[PDB]
């Protein structure tokens, strides 16, 4: 399964795959960084990090670019944050090759209370320990160091958690650009495909070394 107009780009050795779309003058770019530690099962039931990706919706008629922090769970899609950047999709805006996008900008309000609903389930969060310097030993990594992760808001929980009726309109607004649940079912299945091919290539390289 694959969405309608999306080209995949995945080179072996990097835990990243990037999806690109273009309709009219608008360009849609989906970037994902697959976790190396452990990712959750596609059935969901039974350290189990969620599949978090980003979606860049560029519209030159508006003059702004929409960055959508999205989390794919059970094939479906939730959207955690939406931020706006100036101009079109510059190459520096995408966190490929471990160089981040724009720094020191407003991240956006909470569109959904998914992170507060996980603590009722007692699901383990991204923040492992309270000490930020404890998790800064594995620096420049989003999954084990949340204090410098762009997708986890650099550990900051914002003031405003957006109104449900307002932000339901924002999630419907992004679904017309290809940020529907059909993309998140593919990103969930392709992150499990990258996690097997990265672990198999790392093993067979390690066999020839020793």
């Amino acid at each position: 399964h694959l969405p309608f107009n999306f080209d995949v780009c995945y080179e072996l050795g990097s835990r990243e795959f990037t999806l690109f779309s273009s309709v009219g003058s608008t360009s849609v770019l989906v970037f994902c960084n697959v976790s190396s530690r452990r990712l959750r099962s596609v059935k969901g039931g039974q350290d189990r990090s969620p599949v978090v990706f980003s979606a860049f919706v560029s519209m030159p008629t508006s003059g702004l670019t929409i960055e959508a922090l999205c989390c794919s769970s059970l094939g479906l899609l939730v959207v955690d944050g939406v931020s706006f950047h100036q101009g079109p999709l510059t190459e520096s805006m995408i966190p490929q090759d471990a160089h981040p996008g724009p720094e020191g900008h407003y991240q956006g309000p909470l569109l959904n209370q998914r992170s507060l609903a996980e603590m009722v389930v007692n699901t383990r969060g991204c923040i492992t320990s309270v000490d930020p310097f404890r998790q800064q030993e594995s620096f420049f990594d989003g999954h084990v160091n949340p204090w410098n992760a762009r997708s986890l808001r650099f550990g900051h929980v914002p003031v405003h958690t957006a109104k449900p009726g307002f932000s339901d309109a924002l999630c419907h607004f992004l679904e017309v650009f290809g940020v529907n649940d059909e993309l998140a079912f593919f990103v969930e299945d392709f992150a499990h495909l990258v996690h097997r091919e990265e672990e198999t290539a790392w093993t067979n390289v390690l066999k020839t070394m020793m």
């Binding site: 000490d131 310097f133 990265e198 093993t203």
Partner: protein
């Protein structure tokens, strides 16, 4: 230190006290702890990273004509902890993380096998084996990402043939529990020498 000219007499006299009792104590050693054989220890005076370096020659069978020499490199970053979360958060456990590079025969992150180990409670805990550069599989798999490179799975979940072959590869390289004890000893001496330099550099800043 006249109090009319210098309003910071509570700090400048306290830091002059802390210079002497950090030098008048007899528990400290003037000499660095002696490293194991081959290892050369570099440390820049301003930073908190000290480097180890040795050359090595493996055991090569008689069917092969030549044994290529290796390049072992140790990289240790000093551990940071946040005192603002105390006494609320618990006491963070003292552990000594370090990196062990292996390069066959010129930098640190080109054609190098990198293995990360943790010395905690008197033993080594090997965490990840990170590759850098183009390696052979079985095709060529390139790991050209130095910050967000694929570090491999954690060895608690890895396959059993990967584990015992790695520890036989690590015990042959003389990386074991006695080597990690020296990294726990050398980083204490490095942090002690940085602290007396930090007290010396702070007295020049406050009194100015």
């Amino acid at each position: 230190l006249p109090p009319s000219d210098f309003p910071e007499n509570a700090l400048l006299k306290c830091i002059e006290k802390e210079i002497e009792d950090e030098a008048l104590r007899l528990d400290k050693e003037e000499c660095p702890p002696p490293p194991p054989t081959g290892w050369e220890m570099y440390h820049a005076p301003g930073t908190s990273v000290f480097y180890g370096r040795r050359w090595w020659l493996p055991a090569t069978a008689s069917a092969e004509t030549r044994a290529t020499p290796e390049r072992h490199t140790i990289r240790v970053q000093l551990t940071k902890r946040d005192p603002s979360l105390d006494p609320e958060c618990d006491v963070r456990g003292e552990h000594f993380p370090f990196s062990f590079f292996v390069q066959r025969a010129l930098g640190l992150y080109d054609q190098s096998i990198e293995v990360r180990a943790d010395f905690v409670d008197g033993e080594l805990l090997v965490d990840n084996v990170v590759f850098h550069g183009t390696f052979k599989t079985g095709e060529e798999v390139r790991y050209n990402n130095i910050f967000n490179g694929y570090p491999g799975p954690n060895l608690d979940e890895a396959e059993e043939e990967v584990l015992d072959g790695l520890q036989a590869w690590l015990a042959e390289r003389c990386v074991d529990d006695q080597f990690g004890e020296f990294v726990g000893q050398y980083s204490v001496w490095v942090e002690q020498q940085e602290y007396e330099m930090w007290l010396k550099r702070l007295r020049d800043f406050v009194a100015a």
